Symmetry: C3
Subunit: 148 residues, 3 copies
């Protein structure tokens, strides 16, 4: 469980990246496969959804229909092993995006508070808790592609 | 190839960081040593350059002469092993900088699509593909050092 | 020292994250436990402080009383092993925050230049050197929580 330790770390960094990538590239597959069935994704000011079912439900009915596109930058994944099978973790995340509402470009700073769990040697999200530290629409800036 | 796996991961995260660092700190050495000779660096809206030769050619003739300075923030490196010797990968990258043109401060959000390859136990870039999601000059902000 | 290598890497990424987290979540514990006693934290334009004593002294007497809150995004941690016991490293870091002064929202781009050292199999900061590349107060933006 010292090699095994490094292995878990890897496993989870991919899970964390995959949470983010699956929201930005809107990939249902990637996104649904990271949650244990009793997992809870909570986003402050939205609500709690449970399981991959609920994860996909939030993606399709709230997140994706709210923003033309988003990009989440995830850093500082700081893990703490409670047992070789349960991990808690923080990440700071920066997100840029265009709201459908008013066609607005906005900046979210968030802190994600996580819980990971192993079952049959396989690692998945137990709980993800999103907390928005900053929500700031940018006055005289609109994020656009290079061809406008 | 389970320890060997973690090793490759490390190897590549350094390659990815080195791509970025070598553009921001303008270090020819660091930058030239990460490309296999038949590698292609493609940056949408600029062109494709092949090999370390071409990598250094773009650095000196387009990138560096265009910006007074840049800083690239690289996150979410998500690897997929196709064989113990070929890897595909995404990273989201945030870049801040001053264009020589109009002395403008600008923000690029990019997505990099990568291909890594091992030869004689050593890892290098096979293909890097840059795609700019956001190109936004900032209206009333100029990034400056603290001493202005 | 090939498994041992990957282990050190992990050890330090946590140290690096912990530097940042302990400044943003203002956690004295987390912050004090990462410095060898003869370590130097230098922040250009502020000064040098040495040891955990000095680290906590800067936190409580300069950093924390200057900003209502900060969030540091740390990426590109690029390590170089000088011996299996001394490492040098760069990281690029992005920081957002509200200054108490004028209740201003500002953006710091920094480059951190680090030195790590092992003693009795345990890894700690030897030297951290902060250099601010950008210090830019944002004209018509104030970072706020979502409830304002």
């Amino acid at each position: 469980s010292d090699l095994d330790r490094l292995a878990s770390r890897a496993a989870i960094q991919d899970l964390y990246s995959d949470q983010l990538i699956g929201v930005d590239k809107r990939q249902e597959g990637r996104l649904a496969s990271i949650w244990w069935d009793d997992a809870e994704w909570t986003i402050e000011g939205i609500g709690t959804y449970k399981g991959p079912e609920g994860a996909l439900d939030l993606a399709n009915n709230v997140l994706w229909p709210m923003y033309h596109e988003t990009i989440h930058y995830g850093t500082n994944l700081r893990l703490e092993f409670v047992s070789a099978d349960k991990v808690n973790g923080i990440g700071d995340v920066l997100c840029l995006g265009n709201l459908v509402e008013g066609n607005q470009s906005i900046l979210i700073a968030a802190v994600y508070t996580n819980e990971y769990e192993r079952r049959d040697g396989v690692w998945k999200f137990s709980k993800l808790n999103g907390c928005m530290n900053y929500f700031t629409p940018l006055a005289g800036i609109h994020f656009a592609p290079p061809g406008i």
